[PDB]
Protein backbone atom coordinates (compact mmCIF):
# COMPACT_ATOMS: atom_id res chain seq x y z
CA UNK A 1 0.00 0.00 0.00
CA UNK A 2 3.22 2.04 0.14
CA UNK A 3 5.25 4.05 -2.27
CA UNK A 4 7.60 0.74 -2.37
CA UNK A 5 4.42 -0.28 -4.79
CA UNK A 6 5.21 1.70 -7.80
CA UNK A 7 8.56 4.26 -6.67
CA UNK A 8 12.12 3.12 -6.43
CA UNK A 9 15.09 4.35 -4.06
CA UNK A 10 17.75 5.30 -6.58
CA UNK A 11 21.18 7.19 -5.90
CA UNK A 12 20.64 11.14 -6.96
CA UNK A 13 22.71 12.29 -9.63
CA UNK A 14 23.05 16.34 -10.63
CA UNK A 15 23.34 15.18 -14.54
CA UNK A 16 19.95 14.50 -13.87
CA UNK A 17 20.44 11.06 -15.53
CA UNK A 18 22.10 11.16 -19.47
CA UNK A 19 20.41 10.83 -22.81
CA UNK A 20 22.25 9.31 -25.89
CA UNK A 21 23.17 12.15 -28.96
CA UNK A 22 22.33 10.86 -32.75
CA UNK A 23 24.61 12.37 -34.89
CA UNK A 24 23.67 12.80 -38.68
CA UNK A 25 25.26 14.20 -41.59
CA UNK A 26 22.54 14.19 -44.09
CA UNK A 27 24.96 15.55 -47.02
CA UNK A 28 27.48 12.73 -46.82
CA UNK A 29 26.09 9.53 -45.64
CA UNK A 30 23.71 7.30 -47.45
CA UNK A 31 20.37 6.95 -45.53
CA UNK A 32 20.05 4.29 -42.82
CA UNK A 33 17.92 0.70 -43.15
CA UNK A 34 14.97 2.58 -42.46
CA UNK A 35 14.89 6.03 -42.74
CA UNK A 36 13.54 8.31 -45.38
CA UNK A 37 15.43 11.70 -46.32
CA UNK A 38 14.38 15.22 -45.65
CA UNK A 39 15.19 19.14 -44.67
CA UNK A 40 13.02 18.83 -41.57
CA UNK A 41 14.10 20.27 -38.75
CA UNK A 42 14.94 17.57 -36.27
CA UNK A 43 14.61 14.32 -37.98
CA UNK A 44 18.09 13.47 -40.24
CA UNK A 45 18.70 9.76 -40.72
CA UNK A 46 21.02 8.14 -37.64
CA UNK A 47 24.55 7.68 -38.35
CA UNK A 48 25.43 6.89 -34.98
CA UNK A 49 24.82 7.14 -31.14
CA UNK A 50 26.70 8.27 -28.15
CA UNK A 51 26.11 9.30 -24.59
CA UNK A 52 26.51 13.35 -24.04
CA UNK A 53 29.87 14.18 -22.86
CA UNK A 54 28.59 14.82 -19.73
CA UNK A 55 28.76 12.32 -16.62
CA UNK A 56 28.71 11.91 -12.70
CA UNK A 57 31.60 12.00 -10.69
CA UNK A 58 31.06 10.61 -7.41
CA UNK A 59 32.19 12.71 -4.82
CA UNK A 60 32.69 12.08 -0.37
CA UNK A 61 33.15 13.90 2.41
CA UNK A 62 32.36 13.79 5.96
CA UNK A 63 31.74 17.56 7.25
CA UNK A 64 29.07 18.00 4.96
CA UNK A 65 26.78 19.37 7.38
CA UNK A 66 30.04 21.10 8.87
CA UNK A 67 29.99 22.54 5.60
CA UNK A 68 26.72 23.67 5.36
CA UNK A 69 27.00 25.08 8.55
CA UNK A 70 30.40 27.04 7.50
CA UNK A 71 28.45 28.04 4.62
CA UNK A 72 25.93 29.30 6.89
CA UNK A 73 28.29 32.06 8.29
CA UNK A 74 30.26 32.58 5.08
CA UNK A 75 26.84 33.53 2.96
CA UNK A 76 26.24 36.58 4.61
CA UNK A 77 22.67 36.14 4.87
CA UNK A 78 19.42 33.15 5.75
CA UNK A 79 17.37 33.02 2.54
CA UNK A 80 17.67 28.93 2.58
CA UNK A 81 16.58 29.05 6.03
CA UNK A 82 13.98 30.71 7.48
CA UNK A 83 12.52 28.90 9.74
CA UNK A 84 15.98 27.78 11.95
CA UNK A 85 13.95 26.58 14.90
CA UNK A 86 11.40 24.26 13.36
CA UNK A 87 12.49 20.81 13.20
CA UNK A 88 10.51 19.76 10.29
CA UNK A 89 11.16 23.11 8.31
CA UNK A 90 14.73 23.20 9.50
CA UNK A 91 17.05 23.41 5.95
CA UNK A 92 17.86 19.89 5.15
CA UNK A 93 21.20 18.39 5.88
CA UNK A 94 23.80 18.67 2.89
CA UNK A 95 24.55 14.57 1.60
CA UNK A 96 28.03 13.24 2.81
CA UNK A 97 27.99 10.93 -0.41
CA UNK A 98 26.82 13.44 -3.61
CA UNK A 99 28.07 14.16 -7.10
CA UNK A 100 29.21 16.68 -9.59
CA UNK A 101 28.93 16.71 -13.36
CA UNK A 102 31.49 16.84 -15.29
CA UNK A 103 31.72 17.81 -18.97
CA UNK A 104 34.56 15.86 -20.82
CA UNK A 105 35.80 15.97 -24.16
CA UNK A 106 34.64 12.84 -26.20
CA UNK A 107 36.15 10.76 -29.21
CA UNK A 108 34.89 8.06 -31.16
CA UNK A 109 34.69 5.95 -34.22
CA UNK A 110 31.20 4.83 -35.20
CA UNK A 111 30.89 1.62 -38.23
CA UNK A 112 32.55 2.24 -41.76
CA UNK A 113 28.69 3.02 -43.19
CA UNK A 114 27.63 3.58 -46.67
CA UNK A 115 28.23 6.92 -48.42
CA UNK A 116 26.90 9.03 -50.94
CA UNK A 117 28.31 8.71 -54.56
CA UNK A 118 29.29 12.23 -55.37
CA UNK A 119 29.63 14.98 -52.40
CA UNK A 120 28.77 18.57 -52.50
CA UNK A 121 31.34 20.50 -51.38
CA UNK A 122 28.62 22.74 -48.48
CA UNK A 123 28.03 19.59 -46.20
CA UNK A 124 26.51 19.41 -42.87
CA UNK A 125 26.98 18.44 -39.38
CA UNK A 126 24.16 17.80 -36.77
CA UNK A 127 23.92 16.69 -33.39
CA UNK A 128 20.50 15.98 -31.73
CA UNK A 129 19.29 14.38 -28.37
CA UNK A 130 16.69 11.47 -27.71
CA UNK A 131 13.82 13.84 -29.20
CA UNK A 132 15.90 14.26 -31.81
CA UNK A 133 15.86 18.12 -31.29
CA UNK A 134 19.72 20.09 -31.53
CA UNK A 135 20.94 20.34 -27.98
CA UNK A 136 22.72 24.01 -27.47
CA UNK A 137 25.07 23.47 -25.22
CA UNK A 138 27.08 21.94 -27.75
CA UNK A 139 30.87 23.36 -28.57
CA UNK A 140 33.06 21.66 -31.62
CA UNK A 141 31.24 19.04 -33.00
CA UNK A 142 33.61 17.28 -35.62
CA UNK A 143 33.38 14.68 -38.18
CA UNK A 144 36.06 13.08 -40.10
CA UNK A 145 35.64 10.35 -42.56
CA UNK A 146 38.24 8.20 -44.15
CA UNK A 147 36.14 6.95 -47.10
CA UNK A 148 36.73 2.82 -48.96
CA UNK A 149 35.43 0.45 -51.13
CA UNK A 150 32.84 -2.19 -49.88
CA UNK A 151 31.82 -3.94 -53.28
CA UNK A 152 31.57 -3.59 -56.75
CA UNK A 153 27.85 -2.40 -58.51
CA UNK A 154 28.56 -2.95 -62.88
CA UNK A 155 28.94 -6.38 -62.74
CA UNK B 1 -3.99 11.74 -79.94
CA UNK B 2 -6.56 12.11 -77.28
CA UNK B 3 -8.25 9.03 -74.30
CA UNK B 4 -11.32 8.68 -74.59
CA UNK B 5 -11.20 7.16 -70.65
CA UNK B 6 -12.07 8.84 -67.51
CA UNK B 7 -9.02 11.29 -66.47
CA UNK B 8 -8.62 14.52 -64.79
CA UNK B 9 -6.58 17.37 -67.31
CA UNK B 10 -5.81 19.68 -63.81
CA UNK B 11 -5.19 18.13 -60.21
CA UNK B 12 -4.52 19.56 -56.70
CA UNK B 13 -2.49 18.38 -54.36
CA UNK B 14 -2.74 18.77 -50.37
CA UNK B 15 0.44 18.81 -49.09
CA UNK B 16 1.63 15.36 -46.80
CA UNK B 17 3.48 17.56 -44.33
CA UNK B 18 4.57 21.24 -43.85
CA UNK B 19 6.77 23.36 -41.23
CA UNK B 20 7.17 26.74 -40.05
CA UNK B 21 10.22 28.79 -38.31
CA UNK B 22 10.26 32.71 -37.47
CA UNK B 23 11.18 33.03 -41.07
CA UNK B 24 10.25 30.54 -43.49
CA UNK B 25 7.89 27.54 -44.56
CA UNK B 26 8.52 24.03 -46.08
CA UNK B 27 5.92 22.28 -47.26
CA UNK B 28 6.23 18.58 -48.92
CA UNK B 29 4.19 16.81 -51.47
CA UNK B 30 3.83 13.04 -53.43
CA UNK B 31 3.43 14.05 -56.79
CA UNK B 32 1.82 11.03 -58.90
CA UNK B 33 2.28 10.60 -62.48
CA UNK B 34 -0.51 7.51 -62.69
CA UNK B 35 0.11 5.00 -65.26
CA UNK B 36 -0.63 6.27 -69.13
CA UNK B 37 0.04 9.99 -67.91
CA UNK B 38 2.96 12.23 -68.73
CA UNK B 39 3.42 15.47 -67.00
CA UNK B 40 5.16 18.39 -68.05
CA UNK B 41 6.25 20.24 -65.20
CA UNK B 42 5.77 24.15 -66.64
CA UNK B 43 2.11 23.52 -66.02
CA UNK B 44 3.02 23.09 -62.08
CA UNK B 45 2.56 25.88 -59.79
CA UNK B 46 2.41 26.51 -55.85
CA UNK B 47 -1.09 27.97 -55.16
CA UNK B 48 -0.62 29.82 -51.65
CA UNK B 49 -3.42 31.55 -49.77
CA UNK B 50 -2.91 33.90 -46.76
CA UNK C 1 41.62 6.12 -49.02
CA UNK C 2 41.84 9.55 -48.17
CA UNK C 3 40.26 11.72 -45.53
CA UNK C 4 37.40 14.31 -45.62
CA UNK C 5 37.17 16.54 -42.63
CA UNK C 6 33.62 17.98 -41.20
CA UNK C 7 35.11 20.94 -38.93
CA UNK C 8 33.17 24.48 -38.07
CA UNK C 9 35.35 27.01 -40.62
CA UNK C 10 34.41 30.16 -39.04
CA UNK C 11 35.36 32.90 -41.78
CA UNK C 12 32.64 35.29 -43.15
CA UNK C 13 32.29 33.51 -46.17
CA UNK C 14 31.25 30.55 -44.77
CA UNK C 15 29.80 32.58 -41.71
CA UNK C 16 27.41 34.02 -43.89
CA UNK C 17 25.53 30.54 -43.98
CA UNK C 18 25.72 29.78 -40.05
CA UNK C 19 23.96 33.26 -39.70
CA UNK C 20 20.72 31.00 -37.86
CA UNK C 21 22.34 28.57 -36.75
CA UNK C 22 24.79 26.42 -33.84
CA UNK C 23 27.83 24.36 -33.28
CA UNK C 24 24.62 21.42 -33.12
CA UNK C 25 23.60 21.99 -36.57
CA UNK C 26 25.93 23.93 -39.31
CA UNK C 27 27.20 24.04 -43.08
CA UNK C 28 30.97 23.79 -43.48
CA UNK C 29 32.80 22.92 -46.70
CA UNK C 30 34.90 19.83 -47.35
CA UNK C 31 36.82 21.57 -49.81
CA UNK C 32 40.43 22.81 -48.77
CA UNK C 33 42.15 24.30 -51.54
CA UNK C 34 43.78 27.02 -50.34
CA UNK C 35 44.12 29.31 -53.21
CA UNK C 36 40.48 29.20 -53.53
CA UNK C 37 38.47 31.08 -50.62
CA UNK C 38 35.89 29.08 -48.91
CA UNK C 39 33.16 30.86 -50.45
CA UNK C 40 34.63 29.66 -53.98
CA UNK C 41 36.12 26.41 -53.05
CA UNK C 42 31.84 25.62 -51.55
CA UNK C 43 30.68 24.74 -54.46
CA UNK C 44 32.83 22.13 -55.89
CA UNK C 45 32.77 18.94 -55.23
CA UNK C 46 34.44 15.75 -54.69
CA UNK C 47 33.17 12.83 -56.94
CA UNK C 48 34.28 8.79 -55.82
CA UNK C 49 34.08 6.17 -58.99
CA UNK C 50 30.43 5.18 -59.76
CA UNK C 51 30.86 2.10 -59.88
CA UNK C 52 31.78 1.05 -56.47
CA UNK C 53 29.38 1.45 -53.65
CA UNK C 54 31.37 3.20 -51.20
CA UNK C 55 31.84 3.10 -47.25
CA UNK C 56 33.30 6.02 -44.64
CA UNK C 57 35.12 4.94 -41.56
CA UNK C 58 33.79 7.75 -39.70
CA UNK C 59 34.91 9.43 -36.62
CA UNK C 60 33.72 12.05 -34.75
CA UNK C 61 34.66 14.77 -31.56
CA UNK C 62 32.33 16.56 -29.70
CA UNK C 63 32.72 19.40 -26.56
CA UNK C 64 29.62 20.40 -24.65
CA UNK C 65 29.09 23.33 -21.79
CA UNK C 66 25.35 21.76 -20.17
CA UNK C 67 25.12 23.53 -16.96
CA UNK C 68 23.23 21.14 -14.46
CA UNK C 69 19.58 23.19 -13.62
CA UNK C 70 18.25 24.22 -17.45
CA UNK C 71 15.04 25.06 -19.34
CA UNK C 72 16.13 22.91 -22.38
CA UNK C 73 16.53 19.91 -20.98
CA UNK C 74 14.06 20.18 -18.58
CA UNK C 75 16.28 19.93 -14.97
CA UNK C 76 14.82 23.67 -14.04
CA UNK C 77 11.13 23.10 -13.62
CA UNK C 78 8.99 21.09 -10.93
CA UNK C 79 4.80 21.19 -10.76
CA UNK C 80 3.84 21.01 -6.74
CA UNK C 81 0.04 21.65 -5.52
CA UNK C 82 0.37 23.84 -2.42
CA UNK C 83 -2.26 26.02 0.17
CA UNK C 84 -3.64 29.08 -1.90
CA UNK C 85 -5.74 29.65 1.16
CA UNK C 86 -7.16 28.94 4.75
CA UNK C 87 -10.69 30.37 5.80
CA UNK C 88 -11.85 31.10 9.13
CA UNK C 89 -15.69 30.69 10.34
CA UNK C 90 -17.23 33.69 11.36
CA UNK C 91 -18.14 34.41 15.22
CA UNK C 92 -15.65 31.50 16.06
CA UNK C 93 -12.12 33.63 18.18
CA UNK C 94 -9.46 33.47 15.36
CA UNK C 95 -6.44 31.67 17.96
CA UNK C 96 -9.51 29.05 19.00
CA UNK C 97 -9.71 26.24 16.77
CA UNK C 98 -7.93 26.89 13.34
CA UNK C 99 -10.67 24.46 11.69
CA UNK C 100 -11.77 25.42 8.33
CA UNK C 101 -11.90 25.53 4.12
CA UNK C 102 -8.82 24.76 3.45
CA UNK C 103 -7.68 25.72 -0.94
CA UNK C 104 -4.77 24.36 -3.05
CA UNK C 105 -3.63 25.11 -6.50
CA UNK C 106 -0.70 23.08 -8.97
CA UNK C 107 1.75 25.83 -9.87
CA UNK C 108 5.12 25.18 -11.73
CA UNK C 109 8.04 26.56 -9.79
CA UNK C 110 10.77 27.85 -12.09
CA UNK C 111 14.41 27.82 -10.75
CA UNK C 112 17.17 29.83 -11.67
CA UNK C 113 19.48 29.02 -14.82
CA UNK C 114 22.48 27.53 -15.38
CA UNK C 115 22.73 26.80 -11.65
CA UNK C 116 25.42 24.23 -10.49
CA UNK C 117 25.24 22.06 -7.18
CA UNK C 118 23.91 18.91 -5.74
CA UNK C 119 22.50 20.50 -2.03
CA UNK C 120 22.16 24.01 -3.82
CA UNK C 121 19.33 22.57 -5.88
CA UNK C 122 17.69 20.82 -2.82
CA UNK C 123 17.78 24.92 -1.20
CA UNK C 124 16.29 26.07 -4.70
CA UNK C 125 13.60 24.10 -4.68
CA UNK C 126 12.48 24.84 -1.28
CA UNK C 127 13.27 28.74 -1.90
CA UNK C 128 10.97 28.38 -4.78
CA UNK C 129 8.36 26.45 -2.42
CA UNK C 130 8.72 29.30 0.07
CA UNK C 131 8.65 32.34 -2.58
CA UNK C 132 4.71 30.99 -3.77
CA UNK C 133 4.39 31.48 0.48
CA UNK C 134 5.44 34.69 0.06
CA UNK C 135 3.80 35.88 -2.99
CA UNK C 136 0.12 34.42 -2.67
CA UNK C 137 0.04 32.43 0.86
CA UNK C 138 0.73 35.10 3.19
CA UNK C 139 -2.43 37.73 2.19
CA UNK C 140 -4.68 34.88 2.11
CA UNK C 141 -3.75 33.58 5.91
CA UNK C 142 -2.11 30.22 5.29
CA UNK C 143 -0.41 29.67 8.74
CA UNK C 144 3.75 28.94 7.86
CA UNK C 145 3.66 25.82 9.48
CA UNK C 146 1.02 24.83 6.37
CA UNK C 147 3.95 25.27 3.29
CA UNK C 148 2.15 21.74 2.23
CA UNK C 149 5.19 20.51 0.54
CA UNK C 150 9.08 20.59 1.49
CA UNK C 151 12.25 18.55 0.17
CA UNK C 152 14.10 16.88 2.66
CA UNK C 153 17.43 14.80 3.27
CA UNK C 154 16.68 13.14 7.03
CA UNK C 155 15.48 10.12 8.22
CA UNK C 156 12.80 10.56 10.88
CA UNK C 157 11.92 7.94 12.71
CA UNK C 158 15.32 6.59 13.32
CA UNK C 159 15.77 7.63 17.52
CA UNK C 160 11.89 6.08 17.33
CA UNK C 161 11.20 3.75 21.06
CA UNK C 162 9.07 0.86 19.42
CA UNK C 163 7.17 0.90 23.29
CA UNK C 164 6.84 4.82 23.52
CA UNK C 165 6.61 5.16 19.70
CA UNK C 166 8.31 8.91 20.10
CA UNK C 167 11.46 10.26 18.92
CA UNK C 168 13.41 9.48 22.21
CA UNK C 169 16.24 11.80 21.01
CA UNK C 170 13.62 14.67 21.64
CA UNK C 171 15.21 16.16 18.00
CA UNK C 172 15.30 14.37 14.51
CA UNK C 173 18.77 13.07 13.49
CA UNK C 174 20.36 15.73 11.60
CA UNK C 175 21.71 13.56 9.42
CA UNK C 176 21.75 13.07 4.98
CA UNK C 177 20.52 9.51 4.27
CA UNK C 178 18.76 9.90 0.85
CA UNK C 179 16.40 13.16 -0.26
CA UNK C 180 13.22 13.15 0.85
CA UNK C 181 9.39 14.78 0.13
CA UNK C 182 7.50 15.93 2.91
CA UNK C 183 3.67 16.64 2.27
CA UNK C 184 0.51 17.80 3.99
CA UNK C 185 -3.21 16.74 3.61
CA UNK C 186 -4.76 17.60 0.06
CA UNK C 187 -1.83 18.16 -2.04
CA UNK C 188 1.48 16.77 -3.19
CA UNK C 189 4.44 17.28 -6.64
CA UNK C 190 4.61 16.09 -10.17
CA UNK C 191 7.61 15.00 -12.21
CA UNK C 192 5.59 14.18 -15.10
CA UNK C 193 7.53 16.75 -17.60
CA UNK C 194 10.99 17.46 -15.18
CA UNK C 195 14.07 15.52 -14.86
CA UNK C 196 14.44 16.68 -10.64
CA UNK C 197 13.16 13.40 -9.92
CA UNK C 198 16.60 12.08 -11.29
CA UNK C 199 18.63 14.63 -8.89
CA UNK C 200 16.55 13.46 -5.83
CA UNK C 201 16.93 9.64 -6.63
CA UNK C 202 13.35 9.16 -7.08
CA UNK C 203 12.62 7.09 -9.85
CA UNK C 204 9.16 5.49 -11.48
CA UNK C 205 8.85 1.90 -11.41
CA UNK C 206 6.91 1.37 -14.43
CA UNK C 207 8.27 4.35 -15.76
CA UNK C 208 6.45 3.84 -19.52
CA UNK D 1 30.26 39.91 -55.93
CA UNK D 2 33.21 41.60 -54.74
CA UNK D 3 33.38 44.41 -52.23
CA UNK D 4 34.38 48.17 -53.57
CA UNK D 5 34.86 50.59 -50.19
CA UNK D 6 33.35 53.75 -49.81
CA UNK D 7 35.28 56.27 -52.58
CA UNK D 8 37.03 53.53 -53.68
CA UNK D 9 38.15 53.83 -58.25
CA UNK D 10 40.73 50.80 -58.71
CA UNK D 11 38.81 47.29 -58.28
CA UNK D 12 41.20 44.30 -58.97
CA UNK D 13 40.23 40.92 -59.24
CA UNK D 14 41.83 38.00 -59.55
CA UNK D 15 40.63 34.14 -60.32
CA UNK D 16 43.05 30.85 -58.86
CA UNK D 17 44.37 29.16 -61.64
CA UNK D 18 41.68 26.85 -63.39
CA UNK D 19 40.82 25.37 -67.19
CA UNK D 20 38.68 27.26 -69.36
CA UNK D 21 37.85 25.06 -71.72
CA UNK D 22 33.97 26.47 -73.35
CA UNK D 23 33.66 29.74 -71.82
CA UNK D 24 32.00 32.11 -73.08
CA UNK D 25 33.17 35.63 -71.66
CA UNK D 26 32.21 38.52 -69.54
CA UNK D 27 28.80 40.14 -67.70
CA UNK D 28 29.42 42.81 -65.51
CA UNK D 29 27.52 45.51 -63.29
CA UNK D 30 27.65 47.61 -60.13
CA UNK D 31 25.41 47.32 -57.18
CA UNK D 32 24.75 48.91 -53.71
CA UNK D 33 25.43 46.55 -50.80
CA UNK D 34 22.34 47.59 -48.95
CA UNK D 35 20.58 47.08 -52.18
CA UNK D 36 21.70 43.05 -51.99
CA UNK D 37 20.94 41.03 -49.88
CA UNK D 38 23.29 38.08 -48.76
CA UNK D 39 21.50 34.24 -49.70
CA UNK D 40 23.28 32.25 -48.14
CA UNK D 41 21.24 31.49 -45.31
CA UNK D 42 17.68 31.51 -44.35
CA UNK D 43 17.00 34.94 -43.12
CA UNK D 44 19.83 37.86 -43.57
CA UNK D 45 19.35 40.31 -40.16
CA UNK D 46 21.19 42.94 -42.76
CA UNK D 47 19.02 43.40 -44.88
CA UNK D 48 17.15 46.62 -43.93
CA UNK D 49 15.57 47.21 -47.03
CA UNK D 50 12.76 46.34 -49.35
CA UNK E 1 -5.18 74.51 -29.17
CA UNK E 2 -4.16 78.11 -29.24
CA UNK E 3 -4.50 81.22 -32.19
CA UNK E 4 -1.15 80.91 -33.59
CA UNK E 5 -2.43 76.81 -33.86
CA UNK E 6 -4.52 77.73 -36.50
CA UNK E 7 -1.38 78.97 -38.87
CA UNK E 8 -0.56 75.34 -38.88
CA UNK E 9 0.06 73.56 -42.47
CA UNK E 10 -0.26 70.36 -43.18
CA UNK E 11 1.70 68.47 -46.46
CA UNK E 12 0.53 64.68 -47.75
CA UNK E 13 2.39 61.88 -47.00
CA UNK E 14 4.81 60.57 -49.46
CA UNK E 15 3.21 57.72 -51.70
CA UNK E 16 4.54 54.19 -50.89
CA UNK E 17 3.33 51.19 -53.30
CA UNK E 18 3.64 47.79 -51.31
CA UNK E 19 3.33 44.29 -52.97
CA UNK E 20 4.36 41.44 -54.15
CA UNK E 21 8.07 41.05 -56.19
CA UNK E 22 8.16 40.86 -59.93
CA UNK E 23 7.59 37.53 -60.91
CA UNK E 24 7.40 36.85 -57.12
CA UNK E 25 11.51 36.68 -56.76
CA UNK E 26 12.41 35.88 -53.51
CA UNK E 27 9.08 34.03 -52.44
CA UNK E 28 10.90 30.37 -53.00
CA UNK E 29 14.72 29.56 -51.67
CA UNK E 30 16.73 29.08 -55.00
CA UNK E 31 20.16 28.73 -54.49
CA UNK E 32 20.46 29.16 -50.59
CA UNK E 33 22.32 25.91 -49.20
CA UNK E 34 20.63 25.71 -46.02
CA UNK E 35 17.17 25.41 -47.72
CA UNK E 36 17.01 23.52 -50.69
CA UNK E 37 14.46 22.02 -52.90
CA UNK E 38 13.70 18.85 -53.25
CA UNK E 39 12.44 16.04 -56.29
CA UNK E 40 12.79 12.37 -56.22
CA UNK E 41 11.29 8.95 -56.23
CA UNK E 42 9.95 7.22 -52.75
CA UNK E 43 12.30 4.71 -53.31
CA UNK E 44 15.46 5.96 -53.31
CA UNK E 45 15.78 9.75 -51.32
CA UNK E 46 18.16 10.96 -53.91
CA UNK E 47 17.56 14.23 -54.58
CA UNK E 48 17.87 15.32 -58.60
CA UNK E 49 17.86 19.20 -57.75
CA UNK E 50 21.43 19.98 -56.87
CA UNK E 51 21.40 23.85 -56.11
CA UNK E 52 24.73 26.28 -56.21
CA UNK E 53 25.31 28.89 -53.71
CA UNK E 54 27.07 31.12 -56.78
CA UNK E 55 24.11 30.25 -58.98
CA UNK E 56 21.41 33.19 -59.95
CA UNK E 57 17.98 31.65 -60.99
CA UNK E 58 15.98 34.70 -60.19
CA UNK E 59 17.47 37.17 -62.37
CA UNK E 60 18.14 34.23 -64.89
CA UNK E 61 14.35 34.24 -65.05
CA UNK E 62 13.92 37.55 -65.13
CA UNK E 63 16.10 37.62 -68.26
CA UNK E 64 14.38 34.76 -70.12
CA UNK E 65 11.33 35.71 -70.17
CA UNK E 66 11.91 39.28 -71.86
CA UNK E 67 13.92 36.69 -74.63
CA UNK E 68 10.85 34.84 -74.96
CA UNK E 69 8.39 37.66 -74.50
CA UNK E 70 7.71 41.01 -74.25
CA UNK E 71 7.67 42.28 -70.41
CA UNK E 72 5.35 45.17 -71.51
CA UNK E 73 2.28 43.58 -71.28
CA UNK E 74 0.99 42.59 -67.78
CA UNK E 75 -0.33 39.08 -66.40
CA UNK E 76 -1.42 39.01 -62.99
CA UNK E 77 -1.89 34.96 -62.49
CA UNK E 78 2.57 34.93 -62.24
CA UNK E 79 2.60 38.70 -60.90
CA UNK E 80 4.37 39.64 -64.26
CA UNK E 81 4.73 43.21 -64.49
CA UNK E 82 8.30 44.69 -64.81
CA UNK E 83 9.73 47.42 -62.48
CA UNK E 84 9.59 50.32 -64.32
CA UNK E 85 10.39 54.43 -63.82
CA UNK E 86 9.08 57.07 -66.19
CA UNK E 87 11.64 58.37 -68.61
CA UNK E 88 10.44 62.08 -68.04
CA UNK E 89 11.50 61.57 -64.61
CA UNK E 90 14.68 60.00 -65.37
CA UNK E 91 16.41 62.23 -67.94
CA UNK E 92 14.17 65.74 -67.68
CA UNK E 93 13.13 66.87 -70.62
CA UNK E 94 13.16 70.55 -69.52
CA UNK E 95 11.08 72.22 -72.41
CA UNK E 96 9.62 75.18 -69.97
CA UNK E 97 6.47 75.31 -70.64
CA UNK E 98 3.62 77.09 -73.08
CA UNK E 99 2.38 80.21 -71.09
CA UNK F 1 43.27 35.62 -64.93
CA UNK F 2 43.57 39.06 -63.47
CA UNK F 3 40.98 41.99 -64.04
CA UNK F 4 40.93 45.31 -62.96
CA UNK F 5 38.35 47.46 -63.39
CA UNK F 6 38.66 51.43 -63.08
CA UNK F 7 35.18 52.77 -62.06
CA UNK F 8 34.19 55.83 -60.39
CA UNK F 9 34.12 56.81 -56.69
CA UNK F 10 30.72 56.43 -54.94
CA UNK F 11 29.80 57.53 -51.06
CA UNK F 12 28.47 54.05 -50.00
CA UNK F 13 30.39 50.47 -50.64
CA UNK F 14 29.11 48.94 -53.62
CA UNK F 15 30.14 45.71 -54.98
CA UNK F 16 31.19 44.62 -58.37
CA UNK F 17 28.81 42.18 -59.86
CA UNK F 18 30.52 39.24 -62.13
CA UNK F 19 28.82 36.76 -64.45
CA UNK F 20 31.48 34.74 -65.74
CA UNK F 21 29.52 32.90 -68.45
CA UNK F 22 29.25 29.51 -68.63
CA UNK F 23 27.66 26.38 -69.81
CA UNK F 24 25.49 25.58 -66.48
CA UNK F 25 23.88 22.23 -67.75
CA UNK F 26 21.76 19.26 -66.73
CA UNK F 27 20.81 15.73 -67.90
CA UNK F 28 18.14 13.86 -66.66
CA UNK F 29 17.26 10.18 -66.54
CA UNK F 30 14.12 8.23 -65.98
CA UNK F 31 14.82 4.66 -66.06
CA UNK F 32 11.91 2.74 -64.31
CA UNK F 33 9.16 3.53 -62.69
CA UNK F 34 9.66 4.76 -59.65
CA UNK F 35 13.24 7.40 -59.93
CA UNK F 36 14.55 9.89 -61.73
CA UNK F 37 18.80 10.43 -61.52
CA UNK F 38 20.11 14.28 -63.08
CA UNK F 39 23.20 14.65 -64.48
CA UNK F 40 24.75 18.04 -63.89
CA UNK F 41 27.52 19.91 -65.18
CA UNK F 42 29.00 23.46 -65.65
CA UNK F 43 31.95 23.77 -67.92
CA UNK F 44 33.91 26.68 -66.93
CA UNK F 45 33.52 27.23 -62.77
CA UNK F 46 33.07 23.38 -62.03
CA UNK F 47 30.86 21.92 -59.07
CA UNK F 48 31.06 18.28 -60.37
CA UNK F 49 28.98 15.18 -61.34
Request: proline share 6%; net charge negative.
Amino acid sequence: KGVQSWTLLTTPDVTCGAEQVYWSLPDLMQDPVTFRSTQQVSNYPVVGAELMPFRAKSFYNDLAVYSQLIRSYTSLTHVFNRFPDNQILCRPPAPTITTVSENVPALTDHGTLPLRSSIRGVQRVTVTDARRRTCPYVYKALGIVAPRVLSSRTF
Amino acid sequence: VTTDRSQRLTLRFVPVDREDTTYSYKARFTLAVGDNRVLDMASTYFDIRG
Amino acid sequence: TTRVYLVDNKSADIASLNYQNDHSNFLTTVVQNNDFTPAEASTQTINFDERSRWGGDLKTILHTNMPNVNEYMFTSKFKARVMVARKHPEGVVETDLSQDKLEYEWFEFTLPEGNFSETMTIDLMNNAILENYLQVGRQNGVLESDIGVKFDSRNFKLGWDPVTKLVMPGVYTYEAFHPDVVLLPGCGVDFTESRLSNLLGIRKKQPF
Amino acid sequence: LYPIPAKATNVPISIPSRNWAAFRGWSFTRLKTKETPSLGSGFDPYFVYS
Amino acid sequence: SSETNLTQQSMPNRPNYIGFRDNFVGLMYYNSTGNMGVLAGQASQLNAVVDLQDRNTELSYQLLLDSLGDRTRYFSMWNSAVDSYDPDVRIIENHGVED
Amino acid sequence: LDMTFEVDPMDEPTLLYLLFEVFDVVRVHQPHRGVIEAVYLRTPFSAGN
